[PDB]
Write an enzyme that holds these catalytic residues in place. Structure first.
Site, PDB file in Angstrom:
ATOM      1  CE  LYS A 131      -3.815   1.827   2.772  1.00 45.35           C
ATOM      2  NZ  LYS A 131      -4.916   1.464   3.659  1.00 45.35           N
TER       3      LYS A 131
HETATM    4  C1  44S Z   1      -5.468   2.636   4.346  1.00 39.43           C
HETATM    5  C2  44S Z   1      -6.653   2.382   5.231  1.00 39.43           C
HETATM    6  O1  44S Z   1      -6.232   1.711   6.405  1.00 39.43           O
HETATM    7  C3  44S Z   1      -7.024   3.841   5.464  1.00 39.43           C
HETATM    8  C4  44S Z   1      -8.349   4.190   6.094  1.00 39.43           C
HETATM    9  O2  44S Z   1      -9.387   3.573   5.378  1.00 39.43           O
HETATM   10  C5  44S Z   1      -8.564   5.697   6.113  1.00 39.43           C
HETATM   11  O3  44S Z   1      -9.567   5.978   7.090  1.00 39.43           O
HETATM   12  P1  44S Z   1      -9.663   7.374   7.860  1.00 39.43           P
HETATM   13  O4  44S Z   1      -8.393   7.484   8.643  1.00 39.43           O
HETATM   14  O5  44S Z   1     -10.824   7.091   8.818  1.00 39.43           O
HETATM   15  O6  44S Z   1      -9.922   8.482   6.875  1.00 39.43           O
HETATM   16  O7  44S Z   1      -6.911   4.471   4.201  1.00 39.43           O
HETATM   17  C6  44S Z   1      -5.965   3.737   3.426  1.00 39.43           C
HETATM   18  O8  44S Z   1      -4.971   4.674   3.066  1.00 39.43           O
END
Ligand code: 44S
Ligand code: 44S
Lengths: 316, 316
Positions: A131
C-alpha cells in the site's frame, strides 16, 4: 437479516484494522492496515509478543541501532499481517513508510523489502498488497512493481487525475477515499450536513468506479475512509469496501435489505492517451481538496511511522 | 522626510502594478506585473489603445482564431511592459501563462516567445524578467532559461524548499511572498493579529534572505505581496521590495525615519548538495500553507489568463 449481510451480496467486504478480533468476528475476505493502525495495534496488550518478536528478530539481523529500528518496525508490520493472514483468506495490505511517498526508487525498494519479509515467512505475493500513496512518484513505483509481480494498493486517492493515472499504470487495486473528502468539505465550506448521495466522497468514488468500468480497467476499486454507514450503503456494488470495525458493527446491527447502487451496464469506451506528468500535476492541483488532503495524509502517516520508530528505539 | 524615502536607503523599491501613473509618481527602479494586474490594467480607459494594438498585431500574424488569442494576449502584456519601460530604468517582470506552471518545456517556450516580442520591440534581455511559478517544473525551466541569457523572476515562493531550489538553480531573482502567507495563517489559525516581526510572511522572507546571503547566493531577493506597511518596514534591507501603489502612497505619507532590519554580516558558509526533486517534494509538502497557496496562486493566475483570453476573443 442485516445490512452487512445485504451489502456482501454486492461488494467484497474488507476489514480496516490490525485487530485479529475483528477478523474472527466479521470473517472478511481481505484486510487493510496502515501506519496509524499499526501504531494503534501495537498498543493492544496481546500484541506485545509481536513487538518483542520484531525487536528480537531485528537484533539478530544487525548490530546497528538505525538499521534495527527499521528492521523492527518493518517486521512488526509484517508480523501483524501474518497474524491476520491466518484468519483471512485473501489479501493483507501493508503500507510503506510514507516518508518515501515522493521517491519512486526508495518506494520500490521498500515494497520489495516488505515482500521479502512476507516471502521469507512463507507468504506468496498473491496474498499481499503493498500500500502506498498515489502521488505521481508512487503511481510510477506501482507501475514497475506490478511488472515485477508485486501487487499494490494505491491509496490517498482524492483527485480524478490520481484515479486516471492509477488506472493507466495498471495497478492491482486503488483505495480512493470517501470520509476524508467529507472531512475537508465540512471544514472548508458552510455545508456541514450531506445526504449520502451528495456526500462529496461518495460522488468521488462513484465517478471513479464509473470511469474504471466504462473503460474496461481491471484495477480493483476499493472504497476506503468512512464516517457513517450511509456513505458505505451508497457504494453498495463497489468491487470492495474496506470498513473499520465500528462501522462493520453498525452495519451488522442495522436491520433491512439494501439495494445495489454502483453498476456499469454499458459498452467499453476507447481510452484516451495516457495522462502525462505535467497534465496530472495541472489537474490534481485544480482540486484544492485533493491538494490539501494528499499532502496531509502523507504527513500524518509519516508522523505515525516516526512514533513507531520511537516506540521501537526505546525497546532496543 | 517620509518612510518611502527612508526605506529607499536600504532597499530597491519596485512598483507592483501595470499602471504607468504609479511609475511617474513613485519613479521606481523596476516594475512587476502579473496576469491579474494585466487583466486589471486592460480596464484602464487610457490602455484601450494598447489592447487594440495587440489585437491588430495578432490579426496580422495569422488567420487562426486560437493563435490570434494567444498572440494578442502576449502582445498586450508586452505592450504594457513597453509602456512601463519608458518610465522605469530597470526591469519589467512579465509573467508567463500560469496554465504552463507544471510544464517545463512549455514554460521555456513561452518565456522565449515573450523575450522575442520584447527583443523585436528593441528591448534587450537585461531589462526583462520572465516571471513564473516556482514549482519544480518552473525552477527547472528558469535554470535553463538563465543558461540561455534569459533572466527570470521565480515567484509564488512559499516554502523553504522552494527558496533553496531557486537559489541552487541560479535564477536571477526570486519574489517570495509575505502577504499571502499572512492570509493563510489568518484563515487557518486562531491568531488573526500579528506584530510585524511575528508576521509569518515576514519571518519567511527574512529566513530566505539570511539563507541566501549566508551561502553567497547572488539571486536577488525581492519581497512581494503586502497587506500593510509594517510588513514592508520589517523587511527594510531586503535587496528589492515590490509594492502596490496603495502601500507606496501610505509609505510616502508616513513621516519618520526607519531603520534597516535585514542584514547579513558573517562569513560565507559552504553549500549543501543540491536538493533533489524528491527531497524538494517531501519538504515542500511538509508545509500545509505552502501546499495550499502555491497551487491556489497558480489556479488564480490561470483564471485571469482565461479571462484575458475571453476579453481578447471578443475583440477579434
Ligand atoms: C489505508 C486504510 O487503512 C485507510 C483508512 O481507510 C482511512 O480511514 P480514515 O483514517 O478514517 O480516513 O486508508 C488507506 O490509506
Ligand atoms: C507577482 C506580483 O505582481 C504579485 C503580487 O506581489 C502579489 O500580491 P497579492 O496579490 O496582493 O498577494 O506576486 C508576484 O507573483
Amino acid at each position: 437479516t442485516d445490512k452487512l449481510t445485504s451489502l456482501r451480496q454486492y461488494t467484497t467486504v474488507v476489514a480496516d484494522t490490525g485487530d485479529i478480533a475483528a477478523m474472527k468476528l466479521y470473517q472478511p475476505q481481505d484486510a487493510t492496515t496502515n501506519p496509524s493502525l499499526i501504531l494503534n495495534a501495537a498498543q493492544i496488550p496481546e500484541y506485545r509478543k509481536l513487538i518483542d518478536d520484531a525487536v528480537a528478530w531485528a537484533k539478530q539481523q544487525s548490530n546497528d541501532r538505525a538499521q534495527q529500528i527499521v528492521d523492527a518496525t518493518d517486521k512488526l508490520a509484517v508480523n501483524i499481517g501474518l497474524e491476520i493472514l491466518k484468519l483471512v483468506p485473501g489479501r493483507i495490505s501493508t503500507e510503506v513508510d510514507a516518508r518515501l511517498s515522493y521517491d519512486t526508487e526508495a518506494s520500490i525498494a521498500k515494497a520489495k523489502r516488505l515482500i521479502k519479509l512476507y516471502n521469507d515467512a512463507g507468504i506468496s505475493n498473491d496474498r499481499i498488497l503493498i500500500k502506498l500513496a498515489s502521488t505521481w512518484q508512487g503511481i510510477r513505483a506501482a507501475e514497475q512493481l506490478e511488472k515485477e509481480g508485486i501487487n499494490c494498493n494505491l491509496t490517498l486517492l482524492f483527485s480524478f487525475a490520481q484515479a486516471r493515472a492509477c488506472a493507466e499504470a495498471g495497478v492491482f487495486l486503488i483505495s480512493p477515499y470517501v470520509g476524508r473528502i467529507l472531512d475537508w468539505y465540512k471544514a472548508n465550506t458552510d455545508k456541514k450536513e450531506y445526504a449520502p448521495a451528495e456526500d462529496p466522497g461518495v460522488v468521488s468514488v462513484s465517478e471513479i468506479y464509473q470511469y474504471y468500468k466504462e473503460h474496461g480497467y481491471e484495477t480493483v476499486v476499493m472504497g476506503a475512509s468512512f464516517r457513517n454507514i450511509g456513505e458505505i450503503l451508497e457504494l453498495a456494488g463497489c468491487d470492495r469496501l474496506t470498513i473499520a470495525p465500528t462501522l462493520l458493527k453498525e452495519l451488522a446491527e442495522s436491520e433491512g435489505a439494501i439495494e445495489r447502487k454502483l453498476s456499469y451496464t454499458g459498452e467499453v469506451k476507447a481510452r484516451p492517451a495516457r495522462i502525462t506528468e505535467s497534465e496530472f500535476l495541472w489537474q490534481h492541483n485544480q482540486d484544492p481538496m485533493a491538494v490539501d488532503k494528499l499532502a496531509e495524509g502523507i504527513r500524518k502517516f509519516a508522523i505515525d511511522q516516526e512514533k513507531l520508530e520511537k516506540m521501537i528505539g526505546d525497546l532496543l
